């Protein structure tokens, strides 16, 4: 690799709930300048927030790759779905993003003129909040609504900027996109979009008020009756016995995004990672692992055949923990697996449903975690 998922840096700090994260003006205004400043980037800089979210799907291209390196066992997207490696490759998809969305904060925070040292620790402190859409199906206006928001300006006054979490604007529409007839004319990336191919935010925020009960309910026993990996990772082929699954559960917040009248680009495996609210998604959708982790502890990744097909393994592969999750390497010369994955203190983050239980024994963990899932995704409306 040419740019290795090392992960942020900074100790193992907490991605934050995004109702709190957009509370805190250091790490909000560090997220709203940072943001802009990949999303700003020359599309063919790999560090950059296209070729970021290009990893998931379109463009069918090699990501950080040296220059002889083997062709690809297979021409589509980087991102595993339907299959066992799911959960882990998404794992340290959102590592390399929260990695290089960092490395943007720091260069931020020394335009900073006034508390340059608060800024710098902030940006060390800075993770990929997460959207509790089991508990809050509804998120913050700043996530959704706000074309303005306020942020802390570099001299310390407060200013409104334009909001990047909304959308992407492509520049330019990648020559990748010709074929599909709605996504090649889409200026920026669109959410819930109506027969005019209009955005339509109004009806989002509808069509989540209503599907916030059952996705609750979805979410609980997802996380509560999962004893197999097989029946939790994956989905496929959509069938019953995998219906409880990570992913299963998973695949109701991209169809709410973006499918509107037509399907806007949450709801295509291949233009879901160039919307902004894709990373907040999978931040929740890994601490949904974290948390399953807390009540099966043992229970990883077990062998499973590829079924869709991936740029990393073509359809009928068989796959394991010892797998390579390609694009992401630990180092220059070695691939990441999902085995030392059960471990996101290695990612230098965590979440904050463990802080009273630091250090604690698995047993205590378990039945703490558990009073948090039934007390949260257990009981009535918010
Ligand atoms: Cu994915
Ligand atoms: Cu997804
Ligand atoms: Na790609």
Redesign the pocket.
Known sequence: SLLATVGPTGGVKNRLDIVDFVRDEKFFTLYIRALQAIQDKDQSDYSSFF?LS??????????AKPKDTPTVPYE???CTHSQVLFPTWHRVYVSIYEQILQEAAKGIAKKFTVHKKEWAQAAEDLRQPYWDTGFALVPPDEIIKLEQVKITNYDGTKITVRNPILRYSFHPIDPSFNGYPNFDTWKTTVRNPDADKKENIPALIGKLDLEADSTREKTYNMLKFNANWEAFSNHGEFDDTHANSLEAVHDDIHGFVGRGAIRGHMTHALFA?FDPIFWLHHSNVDRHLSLWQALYPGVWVTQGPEREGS?GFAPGTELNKDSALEPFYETEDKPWTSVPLTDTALLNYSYPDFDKVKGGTPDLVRDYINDHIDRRYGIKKS
């Open positions: 070729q290009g990893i998931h799907g379109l463009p069918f291209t090699p990501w589509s997207g980087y990672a740029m």
